[PDB]
Design a binder for this molecule. Structure first.
Ligand SMILES: CCCCCCCCCCCCCCCCCC(=O)OC[C@H](COP(=O)([O-])OCC(O)COP(=O)([O-])OC[C@@H](COC(=O)CCCCCCCCCCCCCCCCC)OC(=O)CCCCCCCCCCCCCCCCC)OC(=O)CCCCCCCCCCCCCCCCC
Ligand SMILES: CCCCCCCCCCCCCCCCCC(=O)OC[C@H](COP(=O)(O)OCCN)OC(=O)CCCCCCCCCCCCCCCCC
Ligand SMILES: CCCCCCCCCCCCCCCCCC(=O)OC[C@H](COP(=O)(O)OCCN)OC(=O)CCCCCCCCCCCCCCCCC
Ligand SMILES: *P(=O)(O)OCC(C)(C)[C@H](O)C(=O)NCCC(=O)NCCSC(=O)CCCCCCCCCCCCC
Ligand SMILES: CCCCCCCCCCCCO[C@@H]1O[C@H](CO)[C@@H](O[C@H]2O[C@H](CO)[C@@H](O)[C@H](O)[C@H]2O)[C@H](O)[C@H]1O
Ligand code: SF4
Ligand code: SF4
Ligand code: SF4
Lengths: 80, 185, 66, 76, 186, 242, 76, 122, 237, 427
């Protein structure tokens, strides 16, 4: 039987975001030295990986979402 | 789908309201979403139960309530004299919904009409009580005893020697339940 | 049970009887003796308990049975 | 069928094969003669299938195949 | 609101400081806890209800000793029979009418032989031959029995005194209000 | 125990004594005469509109029954489904009754409901061991499982049915239990065979044979003939004398 | 039942499982579940009261308290 | 086969040419399926014994000369085919069609007069 | 505000939504029903029953008239006359065309009466509609391809279809004026069969029955007599 | 000339596919290539059941799945078919009454009500006013009992486990009233042709009133947990949606019929017993989904309580049993004192009463939908044919049409919204 593609998407979106949050943990234990310049760079890095997150939100890649008037209109004209 | 004649007064629904026609403030609407207020109310109702008395009965030290009409295991009764009340009419055999009663009778040595066989298949019986409604002499009853699980189902083939032994055992309670319910019977 | 109830019944039945009940019934319970069965069982009543708990039995045998 | 048994749990699968009153179970020991005696007093045919392949702490191949056949056939 | 006071609810109550504590920390103070009352509920047991107090009644007509013959009140043996009408019967009913409404006077003789003329035509020809040959005029007559329209079937209520459909209407006050997708009907 | 304090003992209140109870005697059939004339009228209209299939109609109390030819099944139920005066859009039940004294053994009984007119109608046809009946699952989706039951329990066969398989009985079951020639306990019984390691199927033996107490039916008839209750609008006019 | 790891016990509850009950004389009913599996306790009633099924569990719990496991292996 | 895998809408044979065509197609499917029936139901018989026994069940009704009788005998076959090809019948129902897995076996009527007399009617 | 019923709004009955044009639908179904009744002989009570009831409902439906109806019908008469080929079932099929993203009408005649059946492109969100809703038959076959393959790929449809914006030789059919929501309620209080949309459901059922009532010839004599003792049960006497 | 004319096949039976008619072309509402569109997808089948709750004891429904969604649902029933309709032909009418307790085994006194009403109609008897009110009171106590099982087991399947335990104490209290009028917690056998078996005991109407004073608070707290809960709402909205036209065409009755916006209750449309004497409302839903059917069932809790209180205040005096010993058993005291009474006692318990010939289809508003029985009488003392119409049998038949395209976690919700006890479905 075919397997559903959403299983792949769960592992992939985790794998990338999990790598992304991992790259931010050094920032949280180096904040005082990083100061304003480090913050700006981390904000830029946070901003880029956020835009890729609104892409899967915008496309339902996780395939989590996505789960009547009649066109026929009659007119009466009368006798011939 | 509706009855004949004029349609019910305002049976048809109102037109649906758009999202911005709804009467619910954004503050109330957004707060109920993020604070999860209706789920908080239900969790609070479980705290209310926590501090209320429980319903539990400690069995077998405390028993649940049973009425005088309760339908438990069968018994064959006597008169104050000591004679068996049963005269082998076989009415309880005819009315049995599950054919659980087998009776063989004849003339006793003294000429009295009495049963020689009286078997009740406790694994055919449905505990309806019909056998005891049909008796003309109150001979067959159902005691309030519900505690008689056995090991083998051969133990559930009650013969006339066991059903009389049951009546001798349970007579005070049988006479008491009959005394309570007789006016209604 | 609850502390107010279980405390009061200790003040009545004593600590040797409190442990007897924990081993069998599993509750601390106090009531008046109503009578004894031929089998030796003892019966108690207390109108002040929860409904269906006003009458109980203390069995005579260790391997008790209904 | 009178089925003498040593262990209660083991014997249970044998009762399914018969109607009520047909498979009778008797608690027996190869060294208790009364249990053997009263197992065969009503029987028409007696079978003896008792046998180990090994000695135990309670039975030597001598005890099982001799002292049991003795004790049982003496009841027959 | 819809609640009635706890003091009328036949459940065990909290007392004193605990009542004040309960009426403070609780969603609805008028809610009971479901614990019944010992001096009131199933008290006495049915086993101590006095046997001699209860009375098994009789109603005067059917249970009397002196003015009821059984055969006036034997409605089981006055049961209705099923009334059957086949195609032969309806040919005759249209042909010569009905004991309620005749088509011809049928006076004395030469009307009895007209009464078999209804019965004879019924066996020989169905209602289909009968309607074909006497024309569409008496196809209009079959509807003329019920006023020129086909009859509608009988309803099964008689709460208005006549057999009819039940008039399902919205109840005056809705139980969910408009707040839930469920309307109450009377 | 803390009594409610404004909820008194409902048993302690004294009751006003009831003296002589009197109940009028009613004949429950009498309530149905007011609708007897239209139930006859509706059945008469029905069999004039479909003379090809409607052999007769009966009326008992509030029930009008229509008796139809087996080949008329599709037309008759279409008319009773899609007519504006016959808006009978539910099948409530389809079952069979067995009459082995008839050449056609099986009577097929359909019960239909009209929510529009608050009305019920019964349709009866007949079938045989080999004579099939049209299926009406083209008109009522709810009738599908009912016909499986009639087939499973009686052997009647429904032409046009998708997936007419057994619905109630076991998988290799042979026989039709609601037939009157079929015995109550059947012909076979099952058990577990230890030697074969499965459940096996055996010829039926009963430790106690079933005791059939039919012979104790009264030697005397106990209901009688009944009472005729036809409207005068559906009786033949009587010839007046002279 | 064949999938129950040992040790195994079966309780037959009610007249229908015990011996067929109201449907004993039918073509579709097994007259007792012990034509299929072994049973250790039979609880009577249609239906037994909840106390009655509790009583049956206590009978079974007592049967287990009387089960000799390592004391049977010792006699043989 | 709209509702179920092997469903066939109930059809009434139009004539004997049609009725014989259906019988042969029924027999063909059954004897085709015999290897598939012998693995699923673990029948301890050769596929040949299964096929020769399938033949007997058609050989019983070879002399039916009524067209209304053939259709009920065909519907019974189609329904039996559907419940066997879907694993709906238990091994117990299937290998109970073979009338030698009785502990009395195939020999269940008495052979002649005398052997049934000495055994009390078998 | 509530002067007119929203089409497709829920009625209270699940699955039944408010009819876009209830009055003309009911008129179309009644007249169509009256036309198929001429396949049935005059002496059948079925036809008389259906005729009388249908004419009775047809009279009450025609008793109510939408406002501006006389004005609208005069324009619609001319609009049909001067552009008849636009609305011809023999020219543009039973459907009014194949460009489902464009308006489609067709003139249909029943029982001496004229109707236009206009099918309107579905209103969808612009954020989800690709190519204004033009149906995607797939990509064109490209590469080395045969004559036969190009035909079955639809090539001859180039010389038949039209750009949806191409509206020069065509004229826009204007819809009929509707009843008011109060007028619809008054229609309901006359006919006496519930909601208007539920009456159309019954009315289009009477239309389908005529086809079965003619094929089976229900007015013909009884097919199979009851053989003796067929409807006999257990009656005494 | 069937079956003779059918020997040679000279006639063919006109199937519904013969009378198919093409849709009207004008007002009619709505290939192989190298692409993957032409490719087919395999499906796999799944064996669902038995679930832990008692009501769905014998369900073996085989689903075909395309990924997650259900393609076709095939319930296999019969696992509790015990031959009731055949065994009823070998019993007298009084003997066959206990068979009705065991059809829908959570709604006992309303099963035996429809059998009594059917037999009473052929008997042509009118049952006394007191038994009419006793039956309508215990028919609503029964309706509350069934809904406590149905609603709380439904939410136990959906995963809410606490309302189940709270309302089974309410169930535990309401079975004390069964065991006081009869001696059974489950199978009373209390409702019988001609009224009820025995008069209610002398303190019961006070004890039901004491229960009544607090039962609404139990509904309100059960309603505290489910009605506004978003998890509950998001598991029942849009699930198992049936249109009003299809519910009728599918033989749906009860809340399955009523939840799609059809106002229809047998109690209001064909009144029986003391229902025409009581004021109550009928909850009718909008969207035809499981959330509507949950909200309609909770409203019936409050409506059944409102009937029980009215029955307590109109309880008339008099016989609770039809006053005729050729039909109902005489009192024990009469049988032991009067000649005619012992004769009528003896013949009723051996032969039974004769029912006049005829057939009747009788329906009541059972808690799970419409429950009806077709009884053929032969004028004798045993029924010639008893047929039970079970509301759940028709509901499970429409499970494929309703669960199509849904998820399996959606289908478990559809099983509970259809009030399904399989002893009802298989008779
Ligand atoms: C918001 C939070 C509360 C929501 C739930 C509703 C609470 C409620 O209705 O309270 C009224 C309710 C009234 O009940 P009642 O039936 O009148 O009780 C009378 C008894 O005499 C009461 O007998 P008692 O012995 O239970 O009372 C004396 C004492 C006995 O307990 C103690 O002295 C210590 C117990 C705890 C330590 C040992 C373990 O208990 C207390 O005073 C409370 C001690 C436990 C509080 C914390 C519990 C865990 C959370 O009061 C309580 O039962 C608890 C009060 C509220 C406690 C909230 C924490
Ligand atoms: C002690 C109290 C807490 C105990 C545990 C509570 C667990 C609650 C879990 C609820 C999960 C509900 C869910 O699955 O989603 C509901 C919903 C989000 O889904 P959505 O599609 O937006 O639904 C709209 C209508 N509910 O709505 C939500 O749940 C969103 C609410 C925000 C969550 C918290 C964020 C910080 C504030
Ligand atoms: C705790 C257990 C204490 C056991 C004490 C010694 C008992 C003894 O002598 O048992 C002998 C046993 C050998 O096994 P036996 O039972 O003789 O025969 C069966 C097949 N070998 O051998 C044993 O079981 C003894 C060793 C026990 C631990 C392994
Ligand atoms: P040739 O022309 O000689 O014969 C062809 C036939 C047989 C058609 C004759 O010409 C003929 O006309 N005979 C009468 C028609 C006929 O055969 N009727 C019955 C047909 S259906 C039938 O026979 C069904 C038999 C049973 C089907 C199932 C068989 C397998 C079940 C068990 C399998 C093993 C366990 C799973
Ligand atoms: C600083 C933190 C920022 C957090 C993220 C901020 C918001 C950005 C994410 C949402 C942006 C809009 O993206 C929007 O997502 C929704 C929900 O899947 C999509 O939703 C739409 O398509 C999907 C896929 O067919 C359907 O399942 C859905 O029913 C439909 O409404 C829209 O196609 C997309 O336009
Ligand atoms: S117990 Fe009663 S009914 Fe039964 S045989 Fe004896 S006397 Fe008759
Ligand atoms: S209670 Fe048991 S023994 Fe008595 S009549 Fe009923 S089924 Fe027979
Ligand atoms: S309650 Fe009675 S009828 Fe029901 S399953 Fe149990 S034993 Fe059988």
């Amino acid at each position: 039987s075919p397997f559903n593609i959403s299983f792949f998407i769960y592992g992939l979106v985790f794998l990338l975001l999990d790598l992304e949050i991992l790259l931010l943990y050094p920032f949280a234990v180096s904040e005082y030295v990083n100061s304003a310049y480090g913050l700006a760079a981390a904000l830029i890095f946070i901003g880029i990986i956020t835009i890729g997150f609104v892409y899967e939100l915008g496309h339902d890649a996780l395939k989590v979402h996505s789960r009547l008037k009649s066109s026929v209109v009659i007119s009466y004209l009368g006798n011939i | 789908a509706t009855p004949a004649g004029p349609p019910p007064k305002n049976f048809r629904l109102p037109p649906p309201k758009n999202w911005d026609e709804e009467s619910e403030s954004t503050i109330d609407k957004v707060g109920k979403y993020f604070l999860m207020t209706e789920m908080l109310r239900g969790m609070y109702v479980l705290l209310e139960q926590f501090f209320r008395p429980p319903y539990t009965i400690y069995y077998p030290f405390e028993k649940g309530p049973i009425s005088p009409r309760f339908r438990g295991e069968h018994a064959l009764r006597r008169y104050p004299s000591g004679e068996e009340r049963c005269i082998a009419c076989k009415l309880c055999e005819a009315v049995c919904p599950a054919q659980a009663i087998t009776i063989e009778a004849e003339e006793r040595a003294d000429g009295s009409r009495r049963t020689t066989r009286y078997d009740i298949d406790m694994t055919k019986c449905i505990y309806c009580g019909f056998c005891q409604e049909s008796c003309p002499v109150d001979a067959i009853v159902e005691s309030p005893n519900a505690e008689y699980a056995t090991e083998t189902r051969e133990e559930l083939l009650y013969n006339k020697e066991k059903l009389l032994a049951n009546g001798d055992k349970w007579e005070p309670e049988l006479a008491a339940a009959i005394r309570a319910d007789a006016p209604y019977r | 049970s609850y502390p107010t109830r279980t405390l009061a019944n200790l003040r009545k039945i004593g600590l040797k009887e409190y442990f007897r009940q924990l081993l069998y019934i599993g509750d601390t319970k106090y009531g008046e003796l109503v009578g004894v069965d031929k089998f030796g069982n003892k019966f108690y009543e207390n109108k002040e308990e929860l409904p269906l708990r006003t009458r109980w039995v203390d069995y005579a045998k260790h391997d008790y049975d209904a | 069928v009178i089925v003498p048994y040593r262990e209660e749990m083991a014997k249970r699968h044998l009762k399914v094969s018969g109607d009520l009153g047909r498979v009778i179970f008797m608690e027996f020991d190869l060294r208790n003669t009364q249990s053997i005696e009263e197992s065969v007093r009503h029987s028409d045919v007696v079978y003896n299938l008792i046998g180990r392949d090994y000695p135990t702490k309670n039975f030597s191949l001598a005890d099982v195949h001799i002292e049991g056949t003795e004790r049982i056939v003496e009841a027959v | 609101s819809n609640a009635v006071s706890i003091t009328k609810k036949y459940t065990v109550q909290s007392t004193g400081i605990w009542e004040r504590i309960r009426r403070a920390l609780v969603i609805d103070p008028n809610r009971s806890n479901g614990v019944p009352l010992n001096p009131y509920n199933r008290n006495p047991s049915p086993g101590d209800n006095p046997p001699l107090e209860y009375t098994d009644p009789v109603t005067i007509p059917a249970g009397d000793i002196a003015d009821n013959p059984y055969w006036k009140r034997d409605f089981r043996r006055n049961y209705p029979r099923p009334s059957v009408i086949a195609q032969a019967q309806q040919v005759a009913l249209l042909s010569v009418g009905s004991a309620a409404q005749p088509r011809v006077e049928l006076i004395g003789e030469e009307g009895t032989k007209a009464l078999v003329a209804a019965e004879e035509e019924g066996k020989e020809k169905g209602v289909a031959k009968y309607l074909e040959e006497k024309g569409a005029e008496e196809a209009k007559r079959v509807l003329a029995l019920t006023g020129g329209l086909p009859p509608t079937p009988s309803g099964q209520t008689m709460v208005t005194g006549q057999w009819d459909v039940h008039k399902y209407g919205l109840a005056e006050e809705q139980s969910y209000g408009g707040s839930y997708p469920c309307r109450s009907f009377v | 125990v803390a009594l409610p304090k404004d909820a008194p003992n409902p048993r302690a209140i004294p009751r006003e004594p009831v003296g002589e109870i009197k109940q009028a005697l009613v004949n429950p059939a009498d309530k149905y005469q007011s609708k007897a004339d239209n139930l006859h009228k509706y059945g008469a209209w029905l069999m004039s509109c479909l003379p090809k299939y409607i052999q007769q109609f009966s009326v008992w109390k509030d029930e009008l029954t229509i008796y139809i030819c087996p080949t008329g099944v599709i037309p008759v139920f279409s008319f009773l489904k899609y007519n504006t005066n016959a808006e009978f859009t539910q099948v409530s039940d389809i079952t069979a009754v067995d009459f082995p004294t008839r050449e056609m053994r099986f009577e097929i009984v359909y019960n239909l409901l009209s929510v529009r007119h608050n009305a019920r109608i019964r349709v009866k046809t007949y079938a045989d061991e080999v004579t099939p009946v049209p299926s009406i699952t083209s008109l009522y989706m709810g009738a599908n499982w009912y016909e499986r039951e009639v087939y499973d329990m009686f052997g009647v066969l429904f032409v046009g049915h998708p997936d007419l398989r057994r619905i109630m009985t076991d998988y290799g079951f042979e026989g039709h239990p609601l037939r009157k020639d079929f015995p109550l306990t059947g012909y076979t019984e099952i058990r577990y065979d230890e030697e074969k390691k499965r459940i096996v199927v055996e010829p039926l033996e009963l430790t106690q044979a079933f005791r059939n107490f039919e012979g104790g039916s009264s030697a005397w008839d106990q209901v009688g003939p009944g009472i005729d209750r036809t409207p005068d609008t559906f009786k033949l006019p009587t010839p007046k004398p002279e | 039942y064949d999938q129950m790891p040992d040790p195994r016990w079966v309780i037959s509850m009610g007249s229908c499982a015990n011996g067929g009950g109201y449907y004993h004389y039918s073509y579709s009913v097994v007259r007792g579940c012990d034509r299929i599996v072994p049973v250790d306790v039979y609880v009577p009633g249609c239906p037994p009261t909840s106390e009655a099924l509790m009583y049956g569990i206590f009978q079974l719990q007592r049967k287990m308290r009387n089960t000799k496991i390592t004391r049977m292996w010792y006699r043989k | 086969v709209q509702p179920t895998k092997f469903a066939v809408t109930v059809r009434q044979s139009r004539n004997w040419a049609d009725a014989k065509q259906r019988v042969i197609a029924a027999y063909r499917a059954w004897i085709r399926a015999a290897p598939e029936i012998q693995t699923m139901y673990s029948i301890p018989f050769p596929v040949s014994h299964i096929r020769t026994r399938i033949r007997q069940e058609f050989e019983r009704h070879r002399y039916v000369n009524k067209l209304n009788v053939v259709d009920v005998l065909l519907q019974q076959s189609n329904a039996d085919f559907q419940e066997t090809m879907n694993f709906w019948r238990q091994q117990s129902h299937v290998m109970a069609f073979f009338k030698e897995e009785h502990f009395r076996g195939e020999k269940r009527l008495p052979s002649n007069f005398i052997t049934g007399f000495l055994e009390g009617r078998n | 505000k509530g002067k007119f019923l929203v089409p497709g709004a829920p009625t209270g009955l699940t699955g039944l939504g408010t009819h876009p044009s209830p009055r003309s639908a009911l008129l179309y179904l009644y007249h169509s029903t009256l036309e198929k009744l001429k396949q049935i002989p005059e002496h059948s009570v079925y036809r008389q029953s259906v005729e009388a009831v249908t004419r009775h409902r047809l009279a009450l439906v025609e008793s109510v008239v939408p406002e501006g109806y006389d004005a609208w019908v005069e324009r619609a008469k001319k609009l049909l006359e001067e552009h008849a080929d636009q609305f011809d079932p023999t020219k543009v099929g039973p459907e009014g065309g194949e460009e489902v993203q464009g308006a489609r009408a067709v003139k249909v005649e029943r029982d001496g009466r004229v109707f236009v059946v206009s099918r309107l492109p579905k209103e969808e969100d612009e954020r989800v509609l690709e190519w204004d809703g033009e149906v995607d038959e797939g990509p064109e076959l490209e590469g080395s391809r045969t004559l036969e393959e190009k035909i079955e790929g639809g090539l001859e449809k180039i010389f038949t279809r039209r750009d949806v914006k191409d509206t020069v030789g065509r004229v826009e059919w204007e819809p009929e004026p509707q009843l008011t929501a109060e007028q619809v309620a008054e229609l309901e209080n006359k006919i006496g069969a519930g909601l208007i949309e539920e009456v159309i459901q019954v009315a289009e059922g009477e239309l389908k029955l005529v086809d079965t009532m003619v094929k089976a010839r229900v007015w013909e004599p009884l097919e199979e007599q009851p053989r003796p003792g067929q409807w006999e049960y257990f009656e005494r006497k | 000339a069937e079956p003779q004319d059918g020997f040679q096949g000279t006639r063919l039976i006109p199937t519904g596919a013969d009378f198919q008619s093409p849709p009207d072309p004008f007002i009619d509402e709505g290939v192989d290539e190298d692409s993957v569109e032409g490719r087919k997808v395999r499906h796999y089948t799944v064996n669902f059941g038995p679930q832990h709750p008692a009501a769905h004891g014998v369900l073996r429904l085989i689903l075909e799945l395309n990924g997650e969604e259900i393609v076709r649902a095939d319930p296999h029933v019969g696992l509790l078919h015990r031959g009731t309709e055949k065994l009823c032909e070998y019993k007298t009418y009084m003997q066959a009454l206990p068979y009705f307790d065991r059809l829908d085994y959570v709604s006992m006194m309303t099963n035996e009500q429809v059998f009594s009403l059917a037999v009473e109609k052929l008997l042509n008897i009118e049952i006394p006013p007191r038994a009419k009110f006793i039956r309508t009171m215990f028919g609503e106590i029964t309706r509350i009992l069934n809904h406590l099982m149905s609603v709380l087991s439904h939410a136990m399947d959906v995963g809410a486990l606490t309302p189940f335990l709270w309302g089974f104490e309410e169930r535990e209290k309401l079975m004390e009233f069964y065991e006081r009028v009869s001696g059974a917690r489950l199978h009373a056998a209390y409702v019988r042709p001609g009224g009820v078996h025995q008069d209610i005991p002398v303190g019961l109407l006070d004890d039901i009133y004491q229960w009544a004073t607090q039962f609404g608070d139990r509904i309100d707290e059960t309603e505290e947990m489910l009605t506004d809960n978003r998890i509950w709402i998001n598991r029942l909205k849009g699930v198992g949606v049936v249109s009003a036209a299809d519910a009728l065409n599918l033989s749906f009755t009860g809340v399955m019929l009523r939840g799609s916006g059809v106002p229809w209750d047998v109690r209001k449309s064909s009144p029986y017993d003391a229902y025409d004497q009581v004021e109550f409302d009928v909850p009718v839903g909008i969207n035809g989904d499981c959330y509507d059917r949950y909200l309609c069932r909770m409203e019936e809790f409050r409506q059944s309580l409102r009937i029980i209180h009215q029955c307590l205040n109109k309880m008339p005096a008099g016989p609770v049993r039809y006053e005729d010993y050729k039909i109902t058993p005489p009192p024990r005291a009469a049988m032991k004192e009067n000649m005619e009474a012992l004769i009528h006692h003896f013949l009723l318990f051996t032969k039974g009463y004769a029912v006049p010939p005829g057939d009747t289809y009788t329906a009541i508003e059972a808690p799970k939908g419409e429950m009806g029985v077709y009884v053929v009488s032969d004028g004798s003392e045993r029924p010639y044919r008893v047929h039970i119409r079970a509301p759940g049998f028709a509901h499970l038949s429409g499970f494929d049409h309703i669960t199509r395209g849904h998820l399996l976690a959606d289908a478990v919700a559809v099983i509970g919204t259809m009030d399904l006890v399989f002893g009802e479905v298989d008779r």
